[PDB]
Amino acid sequence: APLPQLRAYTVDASWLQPMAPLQVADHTWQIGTEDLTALLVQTAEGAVLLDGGMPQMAGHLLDNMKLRGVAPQDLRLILLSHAHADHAGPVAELKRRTGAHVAANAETAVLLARGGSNDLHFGDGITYPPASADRIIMDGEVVTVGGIAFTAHFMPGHTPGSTAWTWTDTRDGKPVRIAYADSLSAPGYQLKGNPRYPRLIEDYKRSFATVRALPCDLLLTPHPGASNWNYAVGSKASAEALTCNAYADAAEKKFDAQLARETA
Amino acid sequence: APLPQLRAYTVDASWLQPMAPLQVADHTWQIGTEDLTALLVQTAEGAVLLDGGMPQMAGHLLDNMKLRGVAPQDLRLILLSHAHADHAGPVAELKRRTGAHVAANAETAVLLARGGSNDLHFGDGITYPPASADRIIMDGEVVTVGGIAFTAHFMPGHTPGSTAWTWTDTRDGKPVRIAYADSLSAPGYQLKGNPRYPRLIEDYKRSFATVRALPCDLLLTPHPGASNWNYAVGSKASAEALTCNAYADAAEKKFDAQLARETA
Amino acid sequence: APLPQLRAYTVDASWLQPMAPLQVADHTWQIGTEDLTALLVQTAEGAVLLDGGMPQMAGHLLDNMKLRGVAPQDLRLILLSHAHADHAGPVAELKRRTGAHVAANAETAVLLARGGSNDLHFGDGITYPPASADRIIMDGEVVTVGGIAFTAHFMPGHTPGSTAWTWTDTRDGKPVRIAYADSLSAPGYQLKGNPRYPRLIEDYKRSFATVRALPCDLLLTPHPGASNWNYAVGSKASAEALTCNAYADAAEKKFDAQLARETA
Amino acid sequence: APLPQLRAYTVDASWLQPMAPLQVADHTWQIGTEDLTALLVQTAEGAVLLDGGMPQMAGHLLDNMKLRGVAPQDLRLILLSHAHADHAGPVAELKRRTGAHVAANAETAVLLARGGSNDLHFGDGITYPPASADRIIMDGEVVTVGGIAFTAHFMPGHTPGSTAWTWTDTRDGKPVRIAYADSLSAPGYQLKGNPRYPRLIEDYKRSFATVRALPCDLLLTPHPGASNWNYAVGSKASAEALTCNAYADAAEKKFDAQLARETA
Ligand SMILES: [Zn+2]
Ligand SMILES: [Zn+2]
Ligand SMILES: [Zn+2]
Ligand SMILES: [Zn+2]
Ligand SMILES: [Zn+2]
Ligand SMILES: [Zn+2]
Ligand SMILES: [Zn+2]
Ligand SMILES: [Zn+2]
């Protein structure tokens, strides 16, 4: 009876279903897959990428970036919601082939540094190639690239370094406040009495109140299903999208129910 | 047609076949599997571990260490041949549960830091949890733990940081010079004109001459099949073991043949 | 007119005034200088060191550790209040000569990783040799060494990774709750509208309330003057020591006054 | 008698004497000081910087880069001879304000990672802000930026990661082979029997033979005095510059004399 072989991280097929760049705002484009959000922001001095998806998506992101007339050297910054395999996967490969820098908080940086290994809840089950953060950002810090200001809002919970990113774009000249809120889920997490995360419940609670007060007109999430986005129906993707109030309220209801049945 | 799922690193069953501690010398014990070498050296001030095997072997190494009366806190140093998934796998987990330090050269340290990702020949196919080296050793540097001196001999080839470790133990009072030579293989490596490793051929050549002149009475390798060690037959494991001269000569013949058919 | 020469970090003479190990509790010893706190905790399975002082203090700490019968290999863990040059200075040298591990939060780890460079308020004026944290701890996480449980309490302010450490020792069999609270000062810090630390004021406020509710019978600080400790008068050092209530209240008064005159 | 205060790294005044960009070739410009070489290469897709000088030179390099019409975001790559305080000083600050990447070998990367601390010969006397290498290069590896190919030649000695950089530029349409050879000196180094660098003498010897066979028409060094460059006399700076043969031969004579008097 030998030791078991290593198990690879396998996801649903729609998570790896490539799609053409779908326009969100005047300068905001979704270049990920049908069920994984990878946001591209085109400015006059470069491009900004928020998240990247699975590790095997690095080639697809460069193809859609070239579709938008963005050379690899035009990508200047990589922002992250949280450093998990399904969102920070291709960050290491993207840094090598584009010459871009990565801005993340300290908790996302140390999780990105060990490639997701030794996760607080998943252990070593979701390991991806490690990457190093070049600039450490704080809560409420502003990151400006080409005249577009990105404000970070810490919302710990899913990961200690979970971060919501807000920035104001336009839609035919009229401003639209966009909020990229991280996941508020806790799949299989032990919430009560977790020795690796003692104040996990308190962090989730303040994170729910943080998402509610976000300057938002249009909301996006790393997983489009959490915000009722349908990336496959083209221009009607934001038809039934949720607000920040409905997103945090529905997430808190699933959290309180999970906490109740975890006690019993 | 979605993107392909991630593929896990799977090895032969005998590579993960656990075995009881087999004695090599007075203070040297093999605690790995039947086809993967993990060496333990018991001194008066602590224990030294050379290599670790696959990532899923961290629990087995601690069990055999406790079999030898070595608590986790007694492990003081972790030496490596090269930082690949099948030899430096459990290093990250071993550092967390034992409180030991890792000594490796600069090239093995940077490969250990990114968990084997972005390999010169394998890319991201063999990723393991990353670990940080605590002390950088040079060629010919002596590392002493509890009166047993470990001398490092750089032999680049399989990896740029491939290292042979030599130390003198005893066998009922009589000294035995032990050489732990790294792998001299190049499975699927592009030898001629490799842009990621231009002087690969020259490094392999000087590495063959390095293994030949090693102070050795008993030779061991990360893979016991390369040195004709049979870990399964108990005390007759070193029956038909090779010398350093025969090991480097047979490895060079397979290298020259690989180089000849690669040209054509 | 050439560019100015580099300026070294120079402190008061009493900060580098070596002293003999002064006993704080049954297992707690102060082994730093007269004006810099370096705490040593002797257990049955090893020793724990909290802070280290200035970088040039690594030799003095080992001498006092040997005075207490603690060999370098007996030091197992290094805890930190915050990663500044006057408290985490010798951490890099202590890790090389003792074989110990460093436990710190993510914000202290990234500050320790760059040796205090690129400080939020000091820039590159207080650079010390960099060191790597081996274990990342969270708020309220318990670290046990030899039966003595260390609980971490995050108190951001002086640095984002400022941490108070609490542990229960004895005094001739009777328990004493010891709290090692980090500095609550802000020397020269820009509090209002700081772009590198937007929520600095809010973090200081919750940190004041955190220090107040600490399980404490005897309080210690990295700088003994902040807690009215007099390390030079021997056994009467804790004569006029402050409580956690008086320490946080007096620190908040100096913070509100600093904030008022900063506005004007 | 308190412990001594920290000593800052102080150099000659001419090492920090700023100068205007002096032209070396069609695309090569010297933008450092009068006695410290900082090379800038202007291509069609970006700029390349070789070395940077002292840590306090980051502002001067950006001013001369803006003098050449190179914005911070135009700097794409930073190459290094060796990671010492007087040559890799401003690398950390340059990476934050320019968005450039650093290419160095493994030995230069680990020395750059700890900011020059724990030097093989200098200890912690020459510490500078740490920086992380983004791409690890090998011996003979080609790095191309904007059509200009940079070939790295390892020449260990001064530091284990000492690297000579060669690239072919033009001079009014006619090609000129430029070699940027690292320092071949050993000031105060213990050459014979050094436990931190056992094969130091053998590495210096092969490094002398490496510099001799460099594809070179015009030679430059990190310190212009070693190559008889006079940065202050304008266009006649390369008047009495040495060849690669004379540079390595004169350096070997000073090495053999140092070795002889070190023995006695
Ligand atoms: Zn996730
Ligand atoms: Zn997810
Ligand atoms: Zn291998
Ligand atoms: Zn192998
Ligand atoms: Zn401080
Ligand atoms: Zn201080
Ligand atoms: Zn130097
Ligand atoms: Zn120099």
Author numbering:
A (entry chain A), B (entry chain A), C (entry chain A), D (entry chain A): 35 to 298
Paper text:
Here, we reveal the structure, binding and cleavage of moxalactam antibiotic bound to L1 metallo-β-lactamase (MBL) from Stenotrophomonas maltophilia. The structure of L1 from S. maltophilia adopts a typical MBL fold with two β sheets decorated with exposed α-helices and loops. The zinc ions are coordinated by H116, H118 and H196 (termed Zn1) and D120, H121 and H263 (termed Zn2). The L1 uses two-zinc scaffold that is central to MBL’s activity, contributing to active site stability, substrate binding, and catalysis.
